[PDB]
Design a protein around this nucleic acid. Structure first.
Length: 73
DNA sequence: GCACAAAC
DNA sequence: GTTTGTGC
């Protein structure tokens, strides 16, 4: 039925990227961390891309082989 | 447009 | 309260 769902390259940033916002701003009242990341996307920091994108590639290649044309159902 | 995950 | 990527 449902296929598996490894973390998405977007939530990847959450894990580590949010650690940054939590260190200097562990007291965010409203939901700003949401629009803040959006700003990082229109300007992705390469210092952060290369590190986790390397493996992020094997995530797609491996699981895509286990579900050739099997899409969401 | 719908289905799935996480943290503040 | 909410965002975003993947797939057609």
């Amino acid at each position: 039925d449902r296929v598996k769902r490894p973390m998405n390259a977007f939530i990847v940033w959450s894990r580590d990227q949010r650690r940054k916002m939590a260190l200097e701003n562990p007291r965010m009242r409203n939901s700003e961390i949401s629009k803040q990341l959006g700003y990082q996307w229109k300007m992705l920091t390469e210092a952060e891309k290369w590190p986790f994108f390397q493996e992020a590639q094997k995530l797609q290649a491996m699981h895509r082989e286990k579900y050739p044309n099997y899409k969401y159902r």
